[PDB]
Amino acid sequence: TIPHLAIDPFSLDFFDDPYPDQQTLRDAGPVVYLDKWNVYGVARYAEVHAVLNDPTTFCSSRGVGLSDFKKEKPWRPPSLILEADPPAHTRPRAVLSKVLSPATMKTIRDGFAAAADAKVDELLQRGCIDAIADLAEAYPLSVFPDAMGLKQEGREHLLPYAGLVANAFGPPNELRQTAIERSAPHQAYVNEQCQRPNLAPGGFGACIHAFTDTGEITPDEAPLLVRSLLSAGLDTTVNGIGAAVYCLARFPGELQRLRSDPTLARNAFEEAVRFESPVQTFFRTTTREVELGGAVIGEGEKVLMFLGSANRDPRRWSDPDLYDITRKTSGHVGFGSGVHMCVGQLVARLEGEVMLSALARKVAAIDIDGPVKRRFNNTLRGLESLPVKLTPA
C-alpha cells in the first residue's frame, strides 16, 4: 500500500537539485517509505501540515533528526524547546516567545534598519561583491550577536556551531560524522557563552536569565535556552537573505516591482522563505499506531517532513515554482506550523525586511557575475557563494 523509494534526500545529488525528486516523492502517494533510511516520508502540503499540527501523535521529544533518543544517545543534551513535547515544552516556549516578542522588536528595529542601510551603502562602494559572505552572512553577524549580548571574541564559532547542529539532525552520513568530528571547539565556546556572567545586560541572553525567577524556567534551564538561540539564530537567516538576493537576481522583474514599492520588502522576504525554504526537513517520531493519508504507521517510527516540498506543492500553491513578491504567503511551512512554529520568526523577518528595504531603495540592478556555489547541509538549503554586481539607483 505504501510506495517504497530509494531516493536519498540527504545525498549531495539531491541537494544539488531537489525539485524533480520532491515531485516524485509527492506524486508517489501521500505517505512514502524511504528504504535508504527506514523512515516514512510526507512531501505534500496537506500531510506535512497535518503532522506538524498533531504533536501528541508525532512527537519531538524522541528527536527531530533521524536518531531516536529512545534508542541512541543524543549527540548533545536535548534542546528544552525543540526536542520537548507539551507540557514540558510550554513554559520554556513562553519565555523565548516573550524574549523575542513583538514588543522586543520595537526596541531593536531602528538599529537593525540602520545597520542594513549602512551595509548596502558599503556594498555599493565596492560594486562587485559576494552576496553570501559580504551580505547574507555579514549583515546578520553585524546585528544578531550584539542583540544576543555576546562578547566580540569567539564569534567565528557561531556559524560553524549552527552548521554542526543542522548537520547532526541528518542521518549518519559523511556530512554528519565530519561535523561531529570537528565539533569540540565550537561546542566549548557556545556552552560557555550561555552562562549568565558572559551575556551583556539588556540582550536576548540576559533577558532569558532574567526570566528564571518567574517560575517559568529555573536558573539551570536558562543556559540551554540561550543555547537554542545560538544554535538557531543565525544560519537560516543567512540562507534566507541569500535566497532573497538570489531570487531578485534571477527574477529581475520582481526586483523592479520591489523598487517601485519598497513596502513589499517584508513579503518579498517571506516569499523567499517559501521559495527556497532554508530548513528543508525535520523529523517526528510516532507515539502510537496512526493512520495518515490512508497509511497505517506503527508506534516508534520516524516520519520525515519535507517542508521545502510542501511549500512547492501544486496542490496548495498556484505556480509554486515562481518567485512572486505579492503572493499570499500565509500558511507556508518554512517556519513550521503549530506549537513549535519558529519562535524566532519575528527576528528573521525583521532582518530580511530591512535588508530588502535597503536594497529596494538603493539598488537599481543585481546581476550575477561569477560562479554560484551551493552550500551542502543535511537539513539546510542555501548558497556558499553568490557573486553579484550591484548597480546604484
Footprint on this chain of ligand ANN (rule: CB under 6 A)? 79, 81-82, 165, 228, 231-232, 279
How many other CB atoms sit within 10 Å of the CB of residue 102? 9
Task: Tell me how far, at minimum, the Cβ of 340 lies from ligand HEM, in Å.
Answer: 4
Of 92-100, 117-125, 171-179, 251-259: span binding ligand HEM (CB under 6 A): 92-100
Q: Closer CB to ligand HEM, residue 2 or residue 94?
A: 94
| End-to-end Cα spacing for the chain | 58
DSSP helix/strand/coil, 300: coil
Q: Please, which residue, 26 or 332, has the CB nearer to ligand HEM?
A: 332
Q: Which is nearer to ligand ANN, 57 or 79 (CB)?
A: 79
Distance CA 151, CA 158 (A): 12
Partner touching 348 among ligand HEM, ligand ANN, none, CB below 5 to 8 Å by kind? ligand HEM
Please tell me the count of residues contacting ligand HEM according to CB under 6 A: 28
Nearer to ligand HEM, 5 or 148 (CB): 148
**Which residue, 64 or 129, has its beta carbon nearer to ligand HEM?**
64
> 183 or 237, CB closer to ligand HEM?
237
Is residue 320 a contact partner of residue 70, using CB atoms and an 8 Å limit? no
Length of the chain: 393
Buried b or exposed e, range 15-33, using 16+ CB within 10 angstroms: beebeebbbebbebbbbbb
Cα distance between residue 146 and residue 204, in whole Å: 9
Pick the closer one to ligand ANN by CB: 66 or 82: 82
Cα–Cα separations (whole angstroms), residue 82 to 47, 122, 284, 315: 20, 37, 11, 29
**Residue 165 interaction partner, one of ligand HEM, ligand ANN, none, beta carbon < 5-8 Å per kind:** ligand ANN
Is residue 140 within 8 Å of 241, Cβ to Cβ?
Answer: yes
| Distance from C-alpha of 234 to C-alpha of 237, rounded to nearest angstrom | 5
Shortest Å distance, C-beta 71 to ligand HEM? 19
Residue environment code for 203-234, b if the CB has 16+ CB neighbours within 10 A, otherwise e: bbbbbbbebbeeeebeeebbbbbbbbbbbbbb
Count of Cβ atoms closer than 10 Å to residue 361 Cβ = 14
Strand partners, 128: 389
Cα-trace Rg, the chain: 20
Window of 7-15, 227-235, 248-256, 357-365 that interacts with ligand HEM by CB under 6 A: 227-235
10 binds ligand HEM (CB under 6 A): no
In the range 141-200, which residues lie near ligand HEM by CB under 6 A? none
Cell numbers given for 271: 516569499
Neighbours of 330 (CB within 10 A): 7
**Mask: binding to ligand HEM, 47-66, rule CB under 6 A, as x and -?**
-------------x---x--
* For ligand ANN, the closer CB: 15 or 282: 282
User: Which region, judged by CB under 6 A, interacts with ligand HEM, from 106-114, 235-243, 355-363, 364-372?
Assistant: 235-243
- Give the footprint of ligand HEM on residues 279-308 (CB under 6 A): 279, 282, 307
Site for ligand HEM (CB under 6 A): which residue of 29, 163, 336, 382? 336
- Site residues (CB under 6 A) for ligand HEM? 60, 64, 81-82, 93, 96, 100, 228-229, 232-233, 236-237, 240, 273, 278-279, 282, 307, 334-336, 340, 342-344, 347-348
